[PDB]
Amino acid sequence: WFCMQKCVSLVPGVTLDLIEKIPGRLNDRRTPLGELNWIFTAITDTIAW
Amino acid sequence: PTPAILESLISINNKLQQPEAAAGVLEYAMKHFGELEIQATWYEKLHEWEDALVAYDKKMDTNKDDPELMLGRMRCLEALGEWGQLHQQCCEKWTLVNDETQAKMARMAAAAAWGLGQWDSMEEYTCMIPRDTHDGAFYRAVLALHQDLFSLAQQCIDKARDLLDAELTAMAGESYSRAYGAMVSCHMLSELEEVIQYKLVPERREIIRQIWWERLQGCQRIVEDWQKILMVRSLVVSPHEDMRTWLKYASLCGKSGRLALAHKTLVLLLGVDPSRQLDHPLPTVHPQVTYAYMKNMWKSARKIDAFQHMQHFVQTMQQQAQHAIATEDQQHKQELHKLMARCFLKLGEWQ
Amino acid sequence: XXXXXXXXXXXXXXXXXXXXXXXXXXXXXXXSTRFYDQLNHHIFELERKGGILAIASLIGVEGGNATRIGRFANYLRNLLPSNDPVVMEMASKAIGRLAMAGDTFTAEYVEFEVKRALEWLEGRRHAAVLVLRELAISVPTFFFQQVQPFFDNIFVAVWDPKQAIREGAVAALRACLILTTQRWYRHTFEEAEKGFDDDRIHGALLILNELVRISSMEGERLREEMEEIMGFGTKPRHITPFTXXXXXXXXXXXXXXXXXXXXXXXXXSLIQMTILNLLPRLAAFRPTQYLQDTMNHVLSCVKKEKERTAAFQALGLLSVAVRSEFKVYLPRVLDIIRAALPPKVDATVFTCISMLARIQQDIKELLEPMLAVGLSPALTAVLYDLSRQIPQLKKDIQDGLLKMLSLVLMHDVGSITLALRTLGSFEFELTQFVRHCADHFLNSEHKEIRMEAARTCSRLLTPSVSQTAVQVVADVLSKLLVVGITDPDPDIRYCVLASLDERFDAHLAQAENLQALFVALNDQVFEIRELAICTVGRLSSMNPAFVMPFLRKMLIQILTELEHSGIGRIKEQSARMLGHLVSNAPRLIRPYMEPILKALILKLKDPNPGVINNVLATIGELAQVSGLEMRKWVDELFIIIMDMLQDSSLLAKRQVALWTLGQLVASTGYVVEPYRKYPTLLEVLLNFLKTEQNQGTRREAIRVLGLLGALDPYKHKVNIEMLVNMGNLPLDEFYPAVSMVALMRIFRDQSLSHHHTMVVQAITFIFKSLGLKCVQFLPQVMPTFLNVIRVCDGAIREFLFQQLGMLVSFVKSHIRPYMDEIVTLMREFWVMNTSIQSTIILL
Amino acid sequence: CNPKSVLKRPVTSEELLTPGAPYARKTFTIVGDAVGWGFVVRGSKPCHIQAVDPSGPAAAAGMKVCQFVVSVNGLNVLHVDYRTVNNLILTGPRTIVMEVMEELEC
Amino acid sequence: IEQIVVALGGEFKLYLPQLIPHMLRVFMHDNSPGRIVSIKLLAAIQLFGANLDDYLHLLLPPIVKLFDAPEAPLPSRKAALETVDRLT
Amino acid sequence: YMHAMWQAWDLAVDICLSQLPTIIEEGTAFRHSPFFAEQLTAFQVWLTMGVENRNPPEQLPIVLQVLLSQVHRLRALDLLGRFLDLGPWAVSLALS
Ligand SMILES: O=P(O)(O)O[C@H]1[C@H](OP(=O)(O)O)[C@@H](OP(=O)(O)O)[C@H](OP(=O)(O)O)[C@@H](OP(=O)(O)O)[C@H]1OP(=O)(O)O
């Protein structure tokens, strides 16, 4: 969804194909993919509270 | 043929950017009129600073000391860069001098103090320079950056540019060549702007140095112009922090037939005097500097000693290479081989 | 633009009229030409004050032009011969504004008024005096052009029995003798002393004072300052935002003045006023008999009325000039001051008590009546400058002054205004007052009270660890932010926001305060919007967790207004706003620099001047922020900017063009190589030095030649017949050849159109006089002459064909090579038009 | 020989401090300029004025070379080093309040 | 326009930026008797819905100038106010 | 949907996958996001003027999430203690 918004102009050279091939896992918080999952959990729990 | 005519002929040639013709006029004077008719000012116009100093020394020995001959000889000393002798003549003669010559003195006295790095003397002299002059603004802006008065520095630079208006406009009218002198003034002003950034932005430092290096190579290879520019950059960059600048400078001094200045420069970079300790071996720290010293020594006709040093140096180099070759220092090894190669070639041609 | 422009014209013709002239000047700042001349003529003939307001205001702002000068000069020349008072001085101000316009006709207009002023030397005499006085101030050079007529005519005309001339002509002589000193004096002293030997008193004294006052500025510099009554170590911002005979005769000057002060004691108010002005300045040059003659007139004038104001001014100068000998008359002066104050004019009395110290412990007792007088701007200026010069009891001064303010603020509107201005002007030693001032501004419907109470509280929070003080500052600053967001009057909102400086950034970075500031970034007023984004950008280091997400959303909106809004003003405002963001939040913008720069380059390649000017100022600020990441685009922006630098057609100012180019070369480090790529760069930048008149622009054009380095002259060389005619030929041949060559140059280009008739009449006469030797010139003349016939229009065609006929009659057989072209010409331009038919048949 | 000394008076300590006799004090307020004030103080104990720019604002408002100072911008600097006074004037405001001893030709 | 908005719905925000320049010119210079073409364009903006998110900063100033202008007629001012109500 | 924290999520994503060209192609080491660091900085700034019983800090649940790692655990444990010090009202919040 981030790659479908108008805000992609701010990051040229970011297509869906790069999102498919994002490295990491959803467990390892030291990887790039696990970083986002960890951040996302914090942001959502903050909005709710 | 008259001396006045010959003098005017010389000044005309310099304005027309024909240095060789004006030199020929001095050769004519030498033959047909000898030496007494040749004033020292003629050498000054021709940029014969060595012969002008000899002339001003001969004149100041016989004739009693005069304001005009003192300023003429002092002007020669600043062009040569003999800041030691130039500052000695200043300190000796201040109360003995009038306020008119005082204003014609301080512009040269401040240059000498700045060269020697005595900032208290430099402050005294700069105040004596008139504010209406380009130099008066420039030297006030320099003592601003020494005291970190950034706000006042920028102010003084702007007035300096304002005073360069008159000079830039006049020289631009009659060819680019005449405008070059003014162009160098703005060069030094905009370099002083990039010293304020250098003192404020640690992240910008290596960029500024690269810009400085590329800019100086576009500038003309005249030794006077380089000395001015290097003295400015030396406000925040010691010569050790940028070797290649001062080595290229020494090479120009060598090519221009001023090996004495080249020697001083190289001694300052080496750290010690090999000239004094002839028996000792040359220091290996900063090898590119040492190599420049040896090829200078060869030009100085100490060619048996130079050759011997090169044999010692290459043995040191090849041992310093072998023992220090790890995987890490690969760029250093590649530069050390490029050096050793040029060393071996010099060895051969010298042999 | 015509009907309502004439409706408000009669409105301003018939406070309200000055505001209608200021609004007309404000409308002239944005701005047909014929209708403005008719509207000025409509207001002129009718009233006279509004006509001068129409003329002078437009000329200054819209700019003097040859059309406007030629027309309005007749209007000004008609007013001067006969006019009313007050209107005359307004017309003289319209002369000064015209004379300082800086036009080519200024030389003619000024010397036209000066020559007629000398002819006169009563609406004629006083008009010439006001013209010469204002021109002497504004234009020293052309005022000096007639100095010998100046002195000779004026020393006759001054001593006529008139008052308005004596007031102005001495001020004109003042402006003249100052210009003479810095660069006549014997003829001045002779005619002045001849006049002294009661109309002929107060004028000679002023002339003698001019030689005394100019010789010693120490006397005047004290009077000039009393009438009116950053840091060098600061680090500049890392991103630069866009931007003899008068001393020898001085003895007789006071000698004839010491007797004049006794002679004209109470003869013919006006003379006593000028005496009490001059006496201190003469005494400051040379102070006892001179002092005794001064003291008799001065002390007697203090007890009297209508002079007490100027008397203390002279008395204050006398106390500074005459130090020790004045101490005898201290009991006299202090008794008059102790009697003058109880009645409460006295604003000057305090100013001179400050000059009396400019001391004794008696002043300590003098404070208790001084403060009991009341709050005045003179009093608090004195006590402030009193603690500067003599800080013996600075604490006791602040003790009484704070006690006075406390008595006042424990308790109409304009006094509370000035009391707050006092409270916030100079330093003090304040909790209840500020929590009580938080009540006053909220509960005041007066606009000026709210605006000043805001300025006061923001100044009094300069002392900004105790929890109570923090909670107080938090309360006050929350109320201030509410006023800065919610107040209807946008001036008050702007003042409050501007007052929230760096000092408060520790408090502004709180969540609640930041939520208010965000609302403020959508203010109706663009200027307030600009100021808010600057504050939030500055806080992006304090609380990045809030500020950095919000500036990203704002950045998207800014770039939306740029790209998608098709409107000049909105795009101009959007670029300006992106300027403040780049400068204040460079960390945020660095990752997004390539998108922003592509958007801006696209705006530069679009087919309003202020939009391009703000876009260039933003790109320049991006240069420094980019930090060598913009190199790939440098060659693109260099083409664009060099395209915009050359020629004056482009609306965008060269100044900002040259400034942004500087910042690119500087930050990105493109040196020497641009000279090779763009060789005209050195020809463009040395052309500005011969063309530009602005200093700032010329300054940049040098700073950019600096950063680009000094090119070696050879590297610049790599980057880039009339005498011969005579050298060969004899003179009898040379003269035709040089005549022809000179005619051929005119034949080409559009210059021929102006001189069509004369050029060809010459060439024909040349060929006729030569004979058959003209055949030589045929290959030159014919191809041009035929192409001239092709592109000529109307009447000239017929004439050219007539003269071609003459040519052909002379050339005769030699015309064969060009005959084919001539036929084609004829074939094309043969028409049924009777005129050309007869012409061609003759040919 | 590197330093330059233009002051004939060898020492003035304990002579200034005594009231009256050789000199009469005066206070000079000098406004800053675009390029600087133009005065130098190089007195060890008394902080005498070393030189004054003849074209500068200071020379216009008196400020002769042969002078001594004891207070700058209010603060009394009668007994400090010359370098310390140079720090105070630069770190201070643009306009400087200066007291000049102004010896009366003695 | 109103029919394209109901047809596409969420996908209209891709094409709205092209139309914005013309809509902003309508407000600046509307000579329609009683500005009834403005009132119609307000009624359209109500349909735009959550499409206006990324472009509300563009549309809103014209709408705000419309209902604050005293010279403008009362019908067109009520239409602007009711539009802001809906969009809220 | 219109909460301010959503804007932070966009920036976090932007910075995280602006490195992907260099991570995939160049093989650059993935630098971690400053998000959690900057959020603790905001909580610290709040504590400075947090004596009053104002609106609680938005970042309290983030401080909890930070405790799970070790990278920022020392800083969080410090700040969390300083917060609890403020009063018993704050300890009640941290327990809720
Ligand atoms: O004067 P030379 O003895 O012939 O030495 C030259 C000279 O070097 P210096 O800077 O010491 O004078 C060249 O410099 P230029 O003055 O011509 O600019 C330099 O060339 P570069 O500037 O390209 O380095 C060249 O070096 P190289 O052989 O690597 O091309 C080097 O030659 P030697 O080191 O062999 O004497």
Tab-separated table of N, CA, C and O in Angstrom, chain C residues 597 600-601 603-605 612-613 615-623 630 633-666 668 670 674 678 680-681 684-685 688 700-701 704 708:
chain	number	residue	atom	x	y	z
C	597	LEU	N	14.296	17.979	-6.009
C	597	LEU	CA	15.068	18.653	-7.048
C	597	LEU	C	14.507	18.367	-8.437
C	597	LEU	O	14.541	19.236	-9.316
C	600	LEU	N	11.541	20.614	-8.832
C	600	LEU	CA	11.920	22.010	-9.027
C	600	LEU	C	12.479	22.246	-10.426
C	600	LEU	O	12.211	23.286	-11.039
C	601	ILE	N	13.264	21.298	-10.942
C	601	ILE	CA	13.781	21.417	-12.304
C	601	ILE	C	12.637	21.419	-13.311
C	601	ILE	O	12.673	22.141	-14.315
C	603	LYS	N	9.675	22.633	-12.750
C	603	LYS	CA	9.137	23.988	-12.683
C	603	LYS	C	9.996	24.983	-13.453
C	603	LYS	O	9.464	25.934	-14.038
C	604	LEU	N	11.317	24.789	-13.467
C	604	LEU	CA	12.189	25.678	-14.227
C	604	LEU	C	12.025	25.513	-15.732
C	604	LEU	O	12.324	26.449	-16.481
C	605	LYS	N	11.559	24.352	-16.193
C	605	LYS	CA	11.311	24.114	-17.608
C	605	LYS	C	9.838	24.261	-17.975
C	605	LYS	O	9.407	23.735	-19.006
C	612	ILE	N	9.645	31.949	-10.027
C	612	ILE	CA	10.989	31.522	-10.405
C	612	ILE	C	12.027	32.043	-9.420
C	612	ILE	O	13.019	31.361	-9.133
C	613	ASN	N	11.814	33.243	-8.873
C	613	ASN	CA	12.757	33.786	-7.899
C	613	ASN	C	12.778	32.961	-6.618
C	613	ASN	O	13.845	32.735	-6.037
C	615	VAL	N	11.804	29.738	-6.426
C	615	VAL	CA	12.291	28.407	-6.771
C	615	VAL	C	13.815	28.392	-6.833
C	615	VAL	O	14.460	27.438	-6.382
C	616	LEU	N	14.413	29.454	-7.378
C	616	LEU	CA	15.869	29.552	-7.412
C	616	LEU	C	16.455	29.689	-6.011
C	616	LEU	O	17.505	29.107	-5.715
C	617	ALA	N	15.796	30.455	-5.138
C	617	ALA	CA	16.292	30.605	-3.774
C	617	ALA	C	16.199	29.301	-2.992
C	617	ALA	O	16.962	29.095	-2.042
C	618	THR	N	15.279	28.414	-3.371
C	618	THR	CA	15.165	27.124	-2.700
C	618	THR	C	16.245	26.158	-3.176
C	618	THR	O	16.901	25.500	-2.362
C	619	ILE	N	16.422	26.052	-4.496
C	619	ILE	CA	17.507	25.251	-5.063
C	619	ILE	C	18.852	25.670	-4.483
C	619	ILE	O	19.715	24.827	-4.201
C	620	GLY	N	19.051	26.975	-4.287
C	620	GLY	CA	20.289	27.437	-3.676
C	620	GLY	C	20.452	26.957	-2.247
C	620	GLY	O	21.559	26.627	-1.816
C	621	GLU	N	19.353	26.914	-1.491
C	621	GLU	CA	19.421	26.409	-0.125
C	621	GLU	C	19.579	24.894	-0.100
C	621	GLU	O	20.165	24.347	0.841
C	622	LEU	N	19.060	24.204	-1.118
C	622	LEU	CA	19.263	22.763	-1.224
C	622	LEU	C	20.724	22.423	-1.492
C	622	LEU	O	21.228	21.407	-0.998
C	623	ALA	N	21.404	23.240	-2.304
C	623	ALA	CA	22.821	23.039	-2.601
C	623	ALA	C	23.625	22.754	-1.337
C	623	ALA	O	24.310	21.730	-1.235
C	630	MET	N	24.062	16.108	-4.971
C	630	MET	CA	23.383	16.728	-6.101
C	630	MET	C	24.283	16.855	-7.324
C	630	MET	O	23.939	17.585	-8.259
C	633	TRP	N	22.965	16.272	-10.966
C	633	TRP	CA	22.081	17.287	-11.522
C	633	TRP	C	22.779	18.617	-11.775
C	633	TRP	O	22.149	19.536	-12.304
C	634	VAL	N	24.055	18.744	-11.397
C	634	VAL	CA	24.735	20.034	-11.485
C	634	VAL	C	24.813	20.512	-12.935
C	634	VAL	O	24.577	21.692	-13.223
C	635	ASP	N	25.147	19.615	-13.868
C	635	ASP	CA	25.244	20.016	-15.267
C	635	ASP	C	23.886	20.400	-15.839
C	635	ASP	O	23.816	21.191	-16.788
C	636	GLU	N	22.802	19.858	-15.283
C	636	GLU	CA	21.468	20.253	-15.721
C	636	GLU	C	21.129	21.660	-15.246
C	636	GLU	O	20.699	22.508	-16.036
C	637	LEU	N	21.311	21.923	-13.949
C	637	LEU	CA	21.031	23.249	-13.406
C	637	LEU	C	21.966	24.310	-13.971
C	637	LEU	O	21.587	25.482	-14.057
C	638	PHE	N	23.184	23.927	-14.362
C	638	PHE	CA	24.108	24.901	-14.931
C	638	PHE	C	23.633	25.388	-16.294
C	638	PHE	O	23.711	26.586	-16.591
C	639	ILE	N	23.151	24.474	-17.138
C	639	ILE	CA	22.552	24.869	-18.411
C	639	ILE	C	21.367	25.798	-18.178
C	639	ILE	O	21.277	26.880	-18.773
C	640	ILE	N	20.429	25.376	-17.324
C	640	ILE	CA	19.242	26.178	-17.025
C	640	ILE	C	19.631	27.587	-16.591
C	640	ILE	O	19.098	28.582	-17.094
C	641	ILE	N	20.571	27.692	-15.650
C	641	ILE	CA	20.893	28.993	-15.071
C	641	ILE	C	21.635	29.864	-16.077
C	641	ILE	O	21.366	31.067	-16.194
C	642	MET	N	22.577	29.279	-16.822
C	642	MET	CA	23.244	30.030	-17.881
C	642	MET	C	22.268	30.458	-18.969
C	642	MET	O	22.442	31.520	-19.575
C	643	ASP	N	21.244	29.642	-19.239
C	643	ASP	CA	20.169	30.076	-20.126
C	643	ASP	C	19.458	31.299	-19.563
C	643	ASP	O	19.045	32.191	-20.315
C	644	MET	N	19.306	31.360	-18.242
C	644	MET	CA	18.585	32.449	-17.596
C	644	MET	C	19.467	33.659	-17.325
C	644	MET	O	18.955	34.781	-17.242
C	645	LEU	N	20.778	33.457	-17.179
C	645	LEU	CA	21.677	34.581	-16.929
C	645	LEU	C	21.777	35.487	-18.150
C	645	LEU	O	21.642	36.712	-18.038
C	646	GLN	N	22.019	34.905	-19.322
C	646	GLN	CA	22.166	35.693	-20.538
C	646	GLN	C	20.851	36.383	-20.883
C	646	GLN	O	19.778	35.781	-20.765
C	647	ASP	N	20.942	37.671	-21.234
C	647	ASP	CA	19.829	38.512	-21.672
C	647	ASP	C	19.073	39.063	-20.469
C	647	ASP	O	19.073	38.455	-19.394
C	648	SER	N	18.424	40.213	-20.643
C	648	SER	CA	17.594	40.809	-19.606
C	648	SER	C	16.112	40.527	-19.799
C	648	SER	O	15.294	41.012	-19.011
C	649	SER	N	15.746	39.767	-20.835
C	649	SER	CA	14.339	39.475	-21.088
C	649	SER	C	13.721	38.692	-19.936
C	649	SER	O	12.553	38.903	-19.589
C	650	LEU	N	14.484	37.774	-19.345
C	650	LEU	CA	13.964	36.921	-18.284
C	650	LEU	C	13.480	37.759	-17.106
C	650	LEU	O	14.171	38.675	-16.653
C	651	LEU	N	12.278	37.441	-16.619
C	651	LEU	CA	11.707	38.186	-15.501
C	651	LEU	C	12.537	38.013	-14.235
C	651	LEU	O	12.670	38.951	-13.439
C	652	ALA	N	13.087	36.818	-14.024
C	652	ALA	CA	13.825	36.531	-12.800
C	652	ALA	C	15.031	37.453	-12.660
C	652	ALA	O	15.735	37.737	-13.634
C	653	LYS	N	15.262	37.921	-11.437
C	653	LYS	CA	16.374	38.824	-11.175
C	653	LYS	C	17.707	38.102	-11.322
C	653	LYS	O	17.854	36.940	-10.930
C	654	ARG	N	18.685	38.803	-11.903
C	654	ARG	CA	20.026	38.243	-12.041
C	654	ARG	C	20.668	37.996	-10.681
C	654	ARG	O	21.426	37.033	-10.513
C	655	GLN	N	20.406	38.881	-9.714
C	655	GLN	CA	20.978	38.760	-8.374
C	655	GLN	C	20.813	37.349	-7.818
C	655	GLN	O	21.797	36.672	-7.501
C	656	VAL	N	19.566	36.892	-7.684
C	656	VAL	CA	19.323	35.571	-7.111
C	656	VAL	C	19.842	34.472	-8.032
C	656	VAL	O	20.308	33.428	-7.558
C	657	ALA	N	19.752	34.669	-9.351
C	657	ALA	CA	20.379	33.748	-10.294
C	657	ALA	C	21.859	33.557	-9.982
C	657	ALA	O	22.345	32.426	-9.871
C	658	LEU	N	22.598	34.661	-9.860
C	658	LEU	CA	24.020	34.571	-9.544
C	658	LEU	C	24.262	34.002	-8.151
C	658	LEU	O	25.264	33.311	-7.933
C	659	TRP	N	23.368	34.281	-7.200
C	659	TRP	CA	23.550	33.781	-5.840
C	659	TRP	C	23.422	32.263	-5.780
C	659	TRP	O	24.255	31.584	-5.167
C	660	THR	N	22.379	31.709	-6.405
C	660	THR	CA	22.204	30.259	-6.396
C	660	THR	C	23.328	29.554	-7.152
C	660	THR	O	23.772	28.475	-6.745
C	661	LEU	N	23.798	30.144	-8.256
C	661	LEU	CA	24.942	29.580	-8.967
C	661	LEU	C	26.178	29.535	-8.077
C	661	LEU	O	26.928	28.552	-8.092
C	662	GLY	N	26.417	30.605	-7.314
C	662	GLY	CA	27.467	30.574	-6.306
C	662	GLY	C	27.348	29.393	-5.364
C	662	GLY	O	28.311	28.653	-5.149
C	663	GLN	N	26.161	29.207	-4.779
C	663	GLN	CA	25.975	28.154	-3.784
C	663	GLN	C	26.190	26.768	-4.379
C	663	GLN	O	26.658	25.861	-3.681
C	664	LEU	N	25.851	26.582	-5.655
C	664	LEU	CA	26.074	25.293	-6.302
C	664	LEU	C	27.564	25.018	-6.472
C	664	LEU	O	28.073	23.986	-6.019
C	665	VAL	N	28.273	25.928	-7.150
C	665	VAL	CA	29.722	25.811	-7.305
C	665	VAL	C	30.398	25.594	-5.956
C	665	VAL	O	31.323	24.783	-5.829
C	666	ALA	N	29.941	26.311	-4.927
C	666	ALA	CA	30.580	26.228	-3.617
C	666	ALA	C	30.372	24.856	-2.990
C	666	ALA	O	31.336	24.144	-2.683
C	668	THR	N	28.696	21.903	-4.101
C	668	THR	CA	28.943	20.718	-4.916
C	668	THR	C	30.400	20.604	-5.350
C	668	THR	O	30.861	19.494	-5.638
C	670	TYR	N	32.066	22.210	-8.049
C	670	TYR	CA	32.301	22.216	-9.491
C	670	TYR	C	33.187	23.413	-9.817
C	670	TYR	O	32.706	24.543	-9.939
C	674	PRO	N	33.567	23.616	-15.105
C	674	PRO	CA	32.494	24.393	-15.754
C	674	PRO	C	32.998	25.394	-16.778
C	674	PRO	O	32.312	25.641	-17.778
C	678	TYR	N	31.318	25.450	-20.384
C	678	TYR	CA	30.614	26.674	-20.761
C	678	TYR	C	31.625	27.802	-20.919
C	678	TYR	O	31.988	28.467	-19.936
C	680	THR	N	31.440	30.745	-22.435
C	680	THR	CA	30.890	32.087	-22.285
C	680	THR	C	30.732	32.509	-20.831
C	680	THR	O	30.376	33.665	-20.579
C	681	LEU	N	30.971	31.604	-19.877
C	681	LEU	CA	30.835	31.949	-18.464
C	681	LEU	C	31.689	33.155	-18.089
C	681	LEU	O	31.221	34.062	-17.390
C	684	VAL	N	30.137	36.183	-19.729
C	684	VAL	CA	28.894	36.594	-19.084
C	684	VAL	C	29.185	37.345	-17.790
C	684	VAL	O	28.568	38.378	-17.503
C	685	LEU	N	30.136	36.850	-16.996
C	685	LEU	CA	30.363	37.405	-15.666
C	685	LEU	C	31.165	38.701	-15.702
C	685	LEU	O	31.020	39.534	-14.801
C	688	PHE	N	28.447	41.571	-16.581
C	688	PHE	CA	27.666	42.137	-15.484
C	688	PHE	C	28.394	43.312	-14.841
C	688	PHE	O	27.764	44.294	-14.431
C	700	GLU	N	27.803	39.659	-5.713
C	700	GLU	CA	27.669	38.239	-6.027
C	700	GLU	C	28.482	37.862	-7.261
C	700	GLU	O	29.205	36.860	-7.260
C	701	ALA	N	28.363	38.654	-8.332
C	701	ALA	CA	29.138	38.421	-9.547
C	701	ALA	C	30.639	38.343	-9.297
C	701	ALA	O	31.356	37.715	-10.084
C	704	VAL	N	31.178	34.870	-7.205
C	704	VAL	CA	31.088	33.685	-8.051
C	704	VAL	C	32.339	33.532	-8.910
C	704	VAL	O	32.774	32.406	-9.182
C	708	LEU	N	34.642	29.977	-8.476
C	708	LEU	CA	35.028	29.281	-9.698
C	708	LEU	C	36.533	29.285	-9.931
C	708	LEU	O	36.995	28.632	-10.873
